Amino acid sequence: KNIKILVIGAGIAGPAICYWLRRFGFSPVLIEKYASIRKGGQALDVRGIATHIAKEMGIYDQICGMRTRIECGRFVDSSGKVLHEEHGEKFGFRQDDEVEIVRGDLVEILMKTITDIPCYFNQSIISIQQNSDHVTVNFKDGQVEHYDLVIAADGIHSATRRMVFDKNEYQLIHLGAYLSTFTIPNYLNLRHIDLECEANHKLVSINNDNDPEIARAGFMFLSQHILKDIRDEHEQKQFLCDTFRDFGWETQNILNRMSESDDFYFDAITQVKMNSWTKGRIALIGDAGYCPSPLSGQGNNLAFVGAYILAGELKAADGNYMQAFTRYNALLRPFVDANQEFGVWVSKSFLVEDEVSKEIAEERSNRTLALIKSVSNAITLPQYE
Amino acid sequence: IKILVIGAGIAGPAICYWLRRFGFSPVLIEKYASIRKGGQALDVRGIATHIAKEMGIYDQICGMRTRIECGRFVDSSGKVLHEEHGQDDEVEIVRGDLVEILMKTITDIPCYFNQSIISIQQNSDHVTVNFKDGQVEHYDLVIAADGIHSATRRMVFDKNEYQLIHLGAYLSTFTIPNYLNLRHIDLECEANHKLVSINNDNDPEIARAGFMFLSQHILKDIRDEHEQKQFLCDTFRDFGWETQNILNRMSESDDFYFDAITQVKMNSWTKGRIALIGDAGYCPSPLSGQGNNLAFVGAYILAGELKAADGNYMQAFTRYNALLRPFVDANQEFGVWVSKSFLVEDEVSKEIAEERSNRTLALIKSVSNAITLPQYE
Amino acid sequence: IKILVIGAGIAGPAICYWLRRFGFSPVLIEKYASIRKGGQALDVRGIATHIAKEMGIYDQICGMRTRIECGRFVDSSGKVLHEEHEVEIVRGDLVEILMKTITDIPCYFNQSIISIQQNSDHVTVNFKDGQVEHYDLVIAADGIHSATRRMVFDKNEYQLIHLGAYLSTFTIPNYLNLRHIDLECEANHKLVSINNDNDPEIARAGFMFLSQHILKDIRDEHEQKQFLCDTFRDFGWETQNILNRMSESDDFYFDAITQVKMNSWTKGRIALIGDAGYCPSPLSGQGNNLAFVGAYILAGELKAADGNYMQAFTRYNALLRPFVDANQEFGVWVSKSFLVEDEVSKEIAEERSNRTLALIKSVSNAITLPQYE
Amino acid sequence: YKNIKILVIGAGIAGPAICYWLRRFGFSPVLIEKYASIRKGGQALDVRGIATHIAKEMGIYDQICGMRTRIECGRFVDSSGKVLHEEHDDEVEIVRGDLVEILMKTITDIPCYFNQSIISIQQNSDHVTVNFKDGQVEHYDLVIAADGIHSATRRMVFDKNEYQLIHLGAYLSTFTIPNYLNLRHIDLECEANHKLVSINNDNDPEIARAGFMFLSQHILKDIRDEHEQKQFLCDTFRDFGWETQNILNRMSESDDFYFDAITQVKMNSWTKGRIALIGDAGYCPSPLSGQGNNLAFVGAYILAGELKAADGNYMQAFTRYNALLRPFVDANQEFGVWVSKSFLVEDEVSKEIAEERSNRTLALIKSVSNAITLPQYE
Ligand SMILES: Cc1cc2nc3c(=O)[nH]c(=O)nc-3n(C[C@H](O)[C@H](O)[C@H](O)COP(=O)(O)OP(=O)(O)OC[C@H]3O[C@@H](n4cnc5c(N)ncnc54)[C@H](O)[C@@H]3O)c2cc1C
Ligand SMILES: Cc1cc2nc3c(=O)[nH]c(=O)nc-3n(C[C@H](O)[C@H](O)[C@H](O)COP(=O)(O)OP(=O)(O)OC[C@H]3O[C@@H](n4cnc5c(N)ncnc54)[C@H](O)[C@@H]3O)c2cc1C
Ligand SMILES: Cc1cc2nc3c(=O)[nH]c(=O)nc-3n(C[C@H](O)[C@H](O)[C@H](O)COP(=O)(O)OP(=O)(O)OC[C@H]3O[C@@H](n4cnc5c(N)ncnc54)[C@H](O)[C@@H]3O)c2cc1C
Ligand SMILES: Cc1cc2nc3c(=O)[nH]c(=O)nc-3n(C[C@H](O)[C@H](O)[C@H](O)COP(=O)(O)OP(=O)(O)OC[C@H]3O[C@@H](n4cnc5c(N)ncnc54)[C@H](O)[C@@H]3O)c2cc1C
């Protein structure tokens, strides 16, 4: 199985499928557009059947070792006055094998699992073509490589999806919200605490977990505005500075340190709707194919499942990408629908701030806990040895 | 450090192993669709046996050694003139079997067949390679191990910088069905500056034919197999003996090989980020009997000098050329020394012939140990 | 988990590899001072060939396979009568490969167990040098004459069956200058062979004969050679030249063709594998293949039981019973006509041989191997 | 590889450390522990000097950094609880228990038998006879003791003429209790009358670690009798005040009680035949040196390395081991004595003088921690 396979994107789906592809006898090559591993991102939750895959890969103990250590959580008003304080109650109500871990720590654990897999950074594809025999990949530095299969794991803004799929074959659905997170110097000397302030359909957060020198800032807000270019960091940062102008609290102290952050992340809360995630010798995995959006809390787990099934089906098809890709599209269909529908469900209430009572709030919260456990296990994983 | 190695013969695979063991990540290509296993018996000799032991393949090679029990020199009619019945100085092993052993040591290294380069450029930062299938790849280093007719040397070095010297003789060998039911025996017939051999060793169904003759003729296109075979037939048109029985089975052969006995002469074997190893740089010719050994030493030293220099190819390449020079000269000079009498068939005393044979065996023994290997641990 | 494997033959090394591959840390002991590489050509066949593949030695076994190119049957005066022109490998070569596969497993030599006891917690093993060790499990692979079987199992729980024949084989210098040939001479229900495979300096001699006699002490080497010389006193041909060179041979082997019949091969925390539990005898040609399967299944069942030997040993006996019966019975089937020399033509003999080839292939695949990762 | 039968006694720091390096070098050791589970007691330790390089080559440095102590505030208080002072080179501070855990996770491929202990040892020129508590008799090519200051193996193998235990005039005790004060990432300490009482919390919010250190020339009738230890500790702190009675009341709820005199082991050599002492069993530099764990690191490294360098020839290996460690043991043991000249002496001095003594202590331990150049065994 010396089949040439290209995997685009050193995020979560990308590194995960590289491990499984190698474990099943294939020889993948991994590329990343940025000069180094992007370890940004808020805390993620490895949950449901994804924990089972994590245990199979042999990383579940590492993930448990690098789990979030926040000891206290405070919601405050714009004056800093405490309204609600928690000390870990949130984690009790949740699923059993769920583990919360900062995204970059999870990516680092995944990158250590594929140290024997080639990985080239600062590598950008400019165009892709394919025929019955091979895929042609053209790189910005002048290289032209031929591959038997190409797998895209470059995120919801997948440039591969745009180079391979027509506009009539994929739809991006805006859920009326935006998310941003970045690390800054811990100017508040916070220790194992998360502070959040919600007002006027906006949320501002700042936390400290392990590194006492660094704090992670977070912004979430409702909006239907669309950027001229969702990939222009300068427009992203200006839009964030304008929406949170006059919010008060620690917003300006946070945004003033935004320029010295090395892990900036900003995106719209969006979903990718496709009838198929494969075209010829090219397959999409993770957010590139079926992003459930941050509001589902399931993007990383769907990345895990999609990587395992695609690599497994290729093993079961003895390299017949025609059959594997077809089974891949079918097996993941119910799981994608459950998770994406859950995400839309959450968006109906997210930051709405409708004047509801504790009864209404507790019912939505408990129904979210039940709904997310069923969704996280909405599929039974096959076996491939 | 991305490294391309060109040619899956002896030098190529062997340097892939030594680059991998020293930490590098080589990639190998081969022009032909499958590994080429043709060739006559070769000898792993001298300091090259030490390299083989360090590679962990010495026992395997010994296990695959030739097992010819009898060697008969015969006249054109079949009458036996001379008969013979024949160490860690030397292990004789058919070329194909040694190639197989080398390949099995680099199963973790990617090897791409039916792949050949049409253009090669380099700057101070990388080498750019354009392949026949339209691919373009950048490499930190390119090591050419594509043999005497190396296209890489032709595209990188000017006509001024290399010279191919014809030693006035030709070689051809191929396997045919063992129609004579030979068993661990080699039959040879020499006459009129020509030699015809046929042997059976390890596969009872297969016999290996061999032709060697003196000639100062040069083919119009040495790459044309049709010309090669036509020239071979014209040269042995009426040699007699089993010549026709052998040539008529040539079309059934899967491993036909034919070439002139040639040496490659260069003052340096490197240019920028591109280095040559094996026959592509310093072919000692079949008449030296040391090509594969000089390929082992060339691979081991080049990989080691890249390790000792921490990837500074400038340092490693200069060290490479210097350390290899005395070993190349001794082996090429021995090759030419052999060609002075090869198939000349001068009327000499049986004592003289025996004496020149003793001197040849003594000379190759010393030549095969002409340098001390550096240690790279 | 402390696990003791007794015997560095074929079954022993095989189960050590598998136990290690499944997470255990076995220890291997051997009665003799060094590994015993004696023996004639054996055949890896049937499901055993798949286990060899999963162990990563199949190609190694192929590389060291036999290379005999001609077989001649000859009369006592040297005149040829007949001439002829899955992997066959000499026992010593296969034992080499298996020992290379367990370089991470300790092997202590010159070790002899003298007493064995067990309770529901551990097995206690007494050694001749005075050591006393407790083990969670003890696995016996000490061959047909298993001292462990005799110490653990009552005389009514096992039966030794003599198949009425003997076998001896040893390597001597190649004084005849044989090259890749096997010369055999059959007469009076006795067979004498001498072959040369690869090493041109050595020839391997073989002796086989029918007999109902039993030795006073089957492990006494002097009585073995006396019985051998008396049996071939006036056979003629090369018997004297071969037997006169026994003293310079370093790998003398002699044994009776025997089987071991048991209803169960485990007792508490002790398990038998290989010839010690279900020896099918040389006439079956499946001893080494039965060693492979026993080692594979026993280790696998232990892994699946997460160390619970009660479940593993129960499944070990259950899964192996069909395979053992077929191979043991196949061996008895061969003995009824082995060296008997019935009055039939060569078309009948070659007909029986064709039946044997079909039968042995079915028997060598007479079970389906479970999977354990 | 090597399949020499090697027994390593003691699952602390030196023991697990040497099991790793022996296996890395081609050996197959076996580990035993007297107690039924791994002992994770003890105060914070410092991985320092050349011991940091050994930890890096073991691939545990980041794990050690990951579990580094994270006390945010340190308050020194009087017997009434009033705060008198509040505090806010590749070396890492880490609780001893967490370092033992890490080390046991680097030897997961080596057998480790708990509730195992030796009753007697014999040896001849061919093997060592180790007789076990559960009735086993085993022969070993090499036996390596890492069973601590009161090494039962040393007392079985070495005569009282070959080792000397030096009392440095002080005693130490530490044990975990329920965090009845509800402390978080803080260390509370109180010193008076040549006694020091501490109580802190770092990671487990339900558990606090108590500390006791005092000066005394008294010697226990039997140093291994816990009852005499605690009776001595309670009588020493009878009228101390502060939290001493609260802490010592919760002693019976502790699972990791540690009590010991601050002592050193003085031997001319650390080997006899096929038996070798490593760690505190041979050259314990005392807690006042702050180097026991690091000396255990270097001892395990050099003994294992010299055995590989001599291809299992214990005669040659034991000779290099004794010679090479001598200068390092000398500097660390001497530094521990030097600390004891001022430890808890409480001399009337300026805060400039006390500061100067601390600066000198830090500069000295820096050099003592790098007092030898490590050999390379590749
Ligand atoms: C830096 C970062 C921070 C994030 N933070 C959050 C967060 O706080 N909350 C949340 O819910 N989700 C976040 N996400 C998204 C989250 O990772 C995904 O929703 C999901 O968990 C994993 O999906 P994925 O691995 O398929 O895609 P991603 O995690 O988005 O990974 C895609 C990877 O491909 C790389 N890439 C993109 N384009 C190219 C290209 N042309 N060539 C090569 N490589 C390319 C990207 O740099 C990235 O490393 C973040 C993603 C990133 C990259
Ligand atoms: C099929 C064959 C048979 C031979 N038979 C004999 C013999 O009988 N006697 C003798 O003395 N010597 C023989 N030789 C030459 C002998 O192997 C060499 O003299 C020496 O032993 C090894 O040198 P080398 O590995 O550098 O070159 P070679 O052994 O010649 O190996 C060169 C390899 O590079 C490949 N190659 C060539 N051009 C290209 C290209 N443009 N791109 C990619 N790959 C390329 C070739 O297919 C071959 O696999 C033979 C070589 C070959 C290839
Ligand atoms: C030297 C030798 C030569 C053989 N030659 C042939 C042959 O030519 N043809 C044939 O059909 N079969 C032969 N056999 C038997 C053959 O190996 C088996 O039938 C089968 O292939 C493998 O069975 P086994 O590994 O269970 O037992 P064996 O191969 O017999 O191995 C048993 C091992 O246990 C050891 N052992 C015995 N008693 C003790 C003890 N008390 N303590 C510790 N270790 C002990 C033995 O020394 C031996 O190493 C031979 C066996 C041996 C040992
Ligand atoms: C529970 C405990 C707490 C400690 N607390 C401190 C502290 O607060 N401050 C300080 O400076 N030092 C402390 N030490 C000592 C410190 O670990 C050493 O100074 C050094 O760090 C490591 O030396 P070592 O591993 O050689 O010895 P140790 O750390 O003492 O390790 C000895 C090990 O051997 C085991 N053992 C003892 N006798 C036997 C036997 N007969 N059979 C089998 N195993 C046996 C012990 O249970 C222990 O696991 C403590 C040691 C222990 C065991």
PDB file of N, CA and C in Angstrom, chain D residues 149 164 166 168 263-267 270 279-280 282-286 288-289 291 295 326-340 368:
ATOM      1  N   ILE D 149      17.983   5.087  53.253  1.00  0.00           N
ATOM      2  CA  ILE D 149      18.977   5.371  54.290  1.00  0.00           C
ATOM      3  C   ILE D 149      19.161   4.174  55.215  1.00  0.00           C
ATOM      4  N   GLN D 164      29.055   3.984  58.123  1.00  0.00           N
ATOM      5  CA  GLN D 164      28.962   4.864  59.282  1.00  0.00           C
ATOM      6  C   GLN D 164      27.824   5.846  59.054  1.00  0.00           C
ATOM      7  N   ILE D 166      25.945   9.180  60.162  1.00  0.00           N
ATOM      8  CA  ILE D 166      26.303  10.432  60.821  1.00  0.00           C
ATOM      9  C   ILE D 166      25.034  11.238  61.063  1.00  0.00           C
ATOM     10  N   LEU D 168      23.198  14.581  61.769  1.00  0.00           N
ATOM     11  CA  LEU D 168      23.438  15.997  61.528  1.00  0.00           C
ATOM     12  C   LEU D 168      22.631  16.893  62.460  1.00  0.00           C
ATOM     13  N   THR D 263      20.385  12.430  58.386  1.00  0.00           N
ATOM     14  CA  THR D 263      21.532  11.547  58.545  1.00  0.00           C
ATOM     15  C   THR D 263      22.251  11.395  57.213  1.00  0.00           C
ATOM     16  N   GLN D 264      23.523  10.998  57.290  1.00  0.00           N
ATOM     17  CA  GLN D 264      24.332  10.688  56.120  1.00  0.00           C
ATOM     18  C   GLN D 264      24.941   9.304  56.283  1.00  0.00           C
ATOM     19  N   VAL D 265      25.234   8.669  55.153  1.00  0.00           N
ATOM     20  CA  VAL D 265      25.879   7.361  55.114  1.00  0.00           C
ATOM     21  C   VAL D 265      27.286   7.556  54.572  1.00  0.00           C
ATOM     22  N   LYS D 266      28.282   7.161  55.363  1.00  0.00           N
ATOM     23  CA  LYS D 266      29.691   7.283  55.005  1.00  0.00           C
ATOM     24  C   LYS D 266      30.268   5.888  54.786  1.00  0.00           C
ATOM     25  N   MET D 267      30.632   5.590  53.541  1.00  0.00           N
ATOM     26  CA  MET D 267      31.281   4.340  53.172  1.00  0.00           C
ATOM     27  C   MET D 267      32.477   4.672  52.290  1.00  0.00           C
ATOM     28  N   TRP D 270      30.973   1.292  47.853  1.00  0.00           N
ATOM     29  CA  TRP D 270      29.534   1.048  47.834  1.00  0.00           C
ATOM     30  C   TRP D 270      29.181  -0.291  47.188  1.00  0.00           C
ATOM     31  N   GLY D 279      21.956   5.300  45.638  1.00  0.00           N
ATOM     32  CA  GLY D 279      21.078   6.221  46.336  1.00  0.00           C
ATOM     33  C   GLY D 279      21.411   6.368  47.814  1.00  0.00           C
ATOM     34  N   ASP D 280      20.368   6.662  48.600  1.00  0.00           N
ATOM     35  CA  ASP D 280      20.540   6.874  50.035  1.00  0.00           C
ATOM     36  C   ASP D 280      21.110   5.650  50.745  1.00  0.00           C
ATOM     37  N   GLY D 282      23.636   4.059  49.995  1.00  0.00           N
ATOM     38  CA  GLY D 282      25.084   4.121  49.960  1.00  0.00           C
ATOM     39  C   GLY D 282      25.699   5.441  50.390  1.00  0.00           C
ATOM     40  N   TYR D 283      25.089   6.567  49.998  1.00  0.00           N
ATOM     41  CA  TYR D 283      25.732   7.874  50.136  1.00  0.00           C
ATOM     42  C   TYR D 283      24.693   8.968  50.403  1.00  0.00           C
ATOM     43  N   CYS D 284      23.635   8.632  51.132  1.00  0.00           N
ATOM     44  CA  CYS D 284      22.594   9.587  51.501  1.00  0.00           C
ATOM     45  C   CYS D 284      23.200  10.917  51.940  1.00  0.00           C
ATOM     46  N   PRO D 285      22.940  12.015  51.230  1.00  0.00           N
ATOM     47  CA  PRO D 285      23.480  13.320  51.638  1.00  0.00           C
ATOM     48  C   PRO D 285      22.594  14.101  52.597  1.00  0.00           C
ATOM     49  N   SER D 286      21.455  13.533  53.005  1.00  0.00           N
ATOM     50  CA  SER D 286      20.525  14.097  53.980  1.00  0.00           C
ATOM     51  C   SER D 286      19.601  15.111  53.311  1.00  0.00           C
ATOM     52  N   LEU D 288      19.031  18.099  54.280  1.00  0.00           N
ATOM     53  CA  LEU D 288      19.609  19.437  54.328  1.00  0.00           C
ATOM     54  C   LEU D 288      20.503  19.719  53.129  1.00  0.00           C
ATOM     55  N   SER D 289      20.912  18.683  52.395  1.00  0.00           N
ATOM     56  CA  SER D 289      21.663  18.895  51.165  1.00  0.00           C
ATOM     57  C   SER D 289      20.755  19.298  50.011  1.00  0.00           C
ATOM     58  N   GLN D 291      19.739  17.361  47.761  1.00  0.00           N
ATOM     59  CA  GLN D 291      20.342  16.718  46.603  1.00  0.00           C
ATOM     60  C   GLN D 291      20.180  15.207  46.587  1.00  0.00           C
ATOM     61  N   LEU D 295      21.409  13.045  43.518  1.00  0.00           N
ATOM     62  CA  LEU D 295      22.481  12.071  43.686  1.00  0.00           C
ATOM     63  C   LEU D 295      21.996  10.672  43.319  1.00  0.00           C
ATOM     64  N   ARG D 326      32.697   9.115  43.689  1.00  0.00           N
ATOM     65  CA  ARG D 326      33.345   9.641  44.891  1.00  0.00           C
ATOM     66  C   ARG D 326      33.408  11.163  44.931  1.00  0.00           C
ATOM     67  N   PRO D 327      33.935  11.864  43.921  1.00  0.00           N
ATOM     68  CA  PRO D 327      33.968  13.336  44.017  1.00  0.00           C
ATOM     69  C   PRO D 327      32.585  13.961  44.135  1.00  0.00           C
ATOM     70  N   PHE D 328      31.588  13.425  43.422  1.00  0.00           N
ATOM     71  CA  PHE D 328      30.238  13.979  43.499  1.00  0.00           C
ATOM     72  C   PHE D 328      29.611  13.721  44.864  1.00  0.00           C
ATOM     73  N   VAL D 329      29.801  12.518  45.415  1.00  0.00           N
ATOM     74  CA  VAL D 329      29.270  12.221  46.744  1.00  0.00           C
ATOM     75  C   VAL D 329      29.939  13.105  47.788  1.00  0.00           C
ATOM     76  N   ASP D 330      31.240  13.362  47.623  1.00  0.00           N
ATOM     77  CA  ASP D 330      31.966  14.185  48.585  1.00  0.00           C
ATOM     78  C   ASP D 330      31.399  15.598  48.634  1.00  0.00           C
ATOM     79  N   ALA D 331      31.197  16.215  47.464  1.00  0.00           N
ATOM     80  CA  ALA D 331      30.722  17.595  47.429  1.00  0.00           C
ATOM     81  C   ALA D 331      29.307  17.710  47.984  1.00  0.00           C
ATOM     82  N   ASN D 332      28.433  16.765  47.635  1.00  0.00           N
ATOM     83  CA  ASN D 332      27.048  16.846  48.086  1.00  0.00           C
ATOM     84  C   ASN D 332      26.927  16.545  49.572  1.00  0.00           C
ATOM     85  N   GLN D 333      27.648  15.531  50.059  1.00  0.00           N
ATOM     86  CA  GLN D 333      27.604  15.236  51.486  1.00  0.00           C
ATOM     87  C   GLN D 333      28.184  16.392  52.291  1.00  0.00           C
ATOM     88  N   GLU D 334      29.305  16.959  51.831  1.00  0.00           N
ATOM     89  CA  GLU D 334      29.899  18.097  52.529  1.00  0.00           C
ATOM     90  C   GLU D 334      28.960  19.299  52.513  1.00  0.00           C
ATOM     91  N   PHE D 335      28.282  19.540  51.389  1.00  0.00           N
ATOM     92  CA  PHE D 335      27.341  20.654  51.355  1.00  0.00           C
ATOM     93  C   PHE D 335      26.221  20.450  52.371  1.00  0.00           C
ATOM     94  N   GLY D 336      25.729  19.218  52.500  1.00  0.00           N
ATOM     95  CA  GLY D 336      24.692  18.953  53.483  1.00  0.00           C
ATOM     96  C   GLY D 336      25.153  19.235  54.900  1.00  0.00           C
ATOM     97  N   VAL D 337      26.392  18.859  55.220  1.00  0.00           N
ATOM     98  CA  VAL D 337      26.942  19.199  56.529  1.00  0.00           C
ATOM     99  C   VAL D 337      27.013  20.710  56.684  1.00  0.00           C
ATOM    100  N   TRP D 338      27.486  21.405  55.647  1.00  0.00           N
ATOM    101  CA  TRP D 338      27.626  22.854  55.726  1.00  0.00           C
ATOM    102  C   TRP D 338      26.297  23.520  56.057  1.00  0.00           C
ATOM    103  N   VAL D 339      25.212  23.078  55.414  1.00  0.00           N
ATOM    104  CA  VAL D 339      23.893  23.639  55.703  1.00  0.00           C
ATOM    105  C   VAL D 339      23.540  23.435  57.171  1.00  0.00           C
ATOM    106  N   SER D 340      23.896  22.272  57.728  1.00  0.00           N
ATOM    107  CA  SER D 340      23.516  21.946  59.099  1.00  0.00           C
ATOM    108  C   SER D 340      24.181  22.848  60.133  1.00  0.00           C
ATOM    109  N   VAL D 368      27.656  22.768  43.619  1.00  0.00           N
ATOM    110  CA  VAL D 368      27.625  21.389  44.100  1.00  0.00           C
ATOM    111  C   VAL D 368      26.784  20.503  43.191  1.00  0.00           C
TER     112      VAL D 368
END
